[PDB]
Design a protein around this ligand. Structure first.
Ligand SMILES: Nc1ncc(-c2ccc(O)cc2)nc1Cc1ccccc1
Ligand SMILES: [Cl-]
Ligand SMILES: [Mg+2]
Ligand SMILES: [Mg+2]
Length: 308
C-alpha cells in the first residue's frame, strides 16, 4: 500500500500502539475495551464514536483534554477491540445497555461531560434525557440531533436507506464491508496512512456476521418516513429535552464542508446555551482537524469548570 504524508507518519499512532494504551473490563456477559487517562478524576469526559469507527477515532484529540479532566473512550460493543453482544443484536438500545452497564463500573462523578460524534452523540443525548441530573456539558459534532425529514443535499436519503434496509444492504455490508471500506475513507478529506486504515479495518477484516454492527447502525436512522419507531421516539424525546436545556452548556463543532453538518446545523442552533466552532472536514472530522478540535474542546471544558 502507498504511504502518503511523512509528517503524519512521524506522529502516527497505529492500531497496536493505541490498543496497548487501553484497558479492558468485563461488562454484563461480555467486555469493553476503552482508553482511560485516569488523572483528574473529579471530572470525566466520555468520548463516544459512532458507526464504522472505534475509540481509535479520538487518538489525536484526547491528548489536548487529558490535562484538564479524566478522559474515557470506549469501543462500543461489537466494535473496535470490545467484546461482542451476547445475543448478536446491535440496535441503539443494545449499545445503550452495554454502555450504561460500563458506566456503572467506572467510578464516575455525579456530573459527566460527553463528547459525541454521529451515533455516539445519539447515545450521549439519550443517556442525558434519561439521567438529566448527571450531565455537566455536551460536545457534539456530525451528530443525530433530530429526526430526519428532508435533507437538502441528500434528496435520495430515503432510497439509499431503503437499499441498506433491504437484503442487498446485507450483501453490501456483510460481504463487501461498505461502511468501513467505502463510506469511511470517502468522508475523510485526507488519505489515511495504511496503518491507520488497518486499525479501522481490523475488527471487520473477516466477511460475514462480525460486520453486523456496521449494518445495524444505519438501519436505526430516525427517518420520519419509515424510521424504526423506537429510535424515532428516542430522538424526538431527547431533541425536545435539548431544546429546553437552558442550563446545560453545549459545544457544537461544525465540519466544513461536512457531511451531516449542512443539514443539522440549524437543528443544533435550536438548543440553547450552545457555543459554535468550525473545523475543516467531512464526516470523520477527527481525522482532518484533531488538534483544532482538541483545543476547542479543552477551552470549552476549562470555561465550564470555571463557571461552575
Ligand atoms: N451514516 C451514513 N452514511 C452513509 C450512508 C449511506 C447509505 C446508503 C448508501 O447507498 C450510501 C450511503 N448511510 C448512513 C446512515 C445514516 C445514519 C444516520 C444519519 C444519516 C445517515
Ligand atoms: Cl450509520
Ligand atoms: Mg518536513
Ligand atoms: Mg446517490
Amino acid at each position: 500500500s502507498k504511504v502518503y504524508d511523512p509528517e503524519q507518519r512521524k506522529r502516527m499512532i497505529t492500531g497496536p500502539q493505541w490498543w496497548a494504551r487501553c484497558k479492558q473490563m468485563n461488562v454484563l456477559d461480555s467486555f469493553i475495551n476503552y482508553y482511560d487517562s485516569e488523572k483528574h478524576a473529579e471530572n470525566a469526559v466520555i468520548f463516544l464514536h459512532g458507526n464504522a469507527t472505534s475509540s481509535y477515532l479520538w487518538r489525536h484529540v484526547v491528548p489536548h483534554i487529558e490535562p484538564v479532566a479524566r478522559c474515557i473512550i470506549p469501543d462500543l460493543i461489537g466494535m473496535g477491540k470490545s467484546g461482542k453482544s451476547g445475543n448478536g443484536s446491535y440496535r441503539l438500545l443494545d449499545h445503550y445497555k452495554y454502555l450504561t452497564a460500563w458506566f456503572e463500573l467506572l467510578n464516575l462523578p455525579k456530573k459527566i461531560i460527553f463528547v459525541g460524534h454521529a451515533w455516539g452523540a445519539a447515545l450521549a443525548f439519550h443517556y442525558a434525557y434519561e439521567h438529566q441530573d448527571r450531565i455537566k456539558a455536551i460536545v457534539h459534532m456530525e451528530s443525530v440531533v433530530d429526526v430526519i425529514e428532508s435533507w437538502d443535499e441528500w434528496p435520495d436519503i430515503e432510497e439509499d436507506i431503503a437499499l441498506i434496509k433491504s437484503e442487498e444492504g446485507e450483501k453490501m455490508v456483510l460481504e463487501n464491508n461498505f461502511f468501513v471500506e467505502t463510506v469511511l475513507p470517502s468522508k475523510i478529506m485526507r488519505k489515511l496512512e495504511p496503518e491507520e486504515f488497518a486499525a479501522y479495518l481490523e475488527p471487520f477484516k473477516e466477511k460475514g456476521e462480525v460486520r453486523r454492527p456496521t449494518l445495524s447502525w444505519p438501519r436505526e436512522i430516525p427517518l420520519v418516513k419509515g424510521g424504526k419507531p423506537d429510535v424515532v421516539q428516542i430522538v424526538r424525546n431527547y431533541n425536545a429535552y435539548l431544546r429546553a436545556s437552558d442550563d446545560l452548556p453545549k459545544l457544537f463543532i461544525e465540519s466544513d464542508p461536512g457531511f451531516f453538518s449542512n443539514a443539522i446545523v440549524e437543528g443544533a442552533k435550536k438548543f440553547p446555551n450552545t457555543e459554535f466552532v468550525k473545523v475543516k472536514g467531512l464526516h470523520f472530522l477527527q481525522e482532518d482537524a484533531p488538534d483544532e478540535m482538541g483545543k476547542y474542546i479543552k477551552s470549552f471544558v476549562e470555561r465550564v469548570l470555571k463557571n461552575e
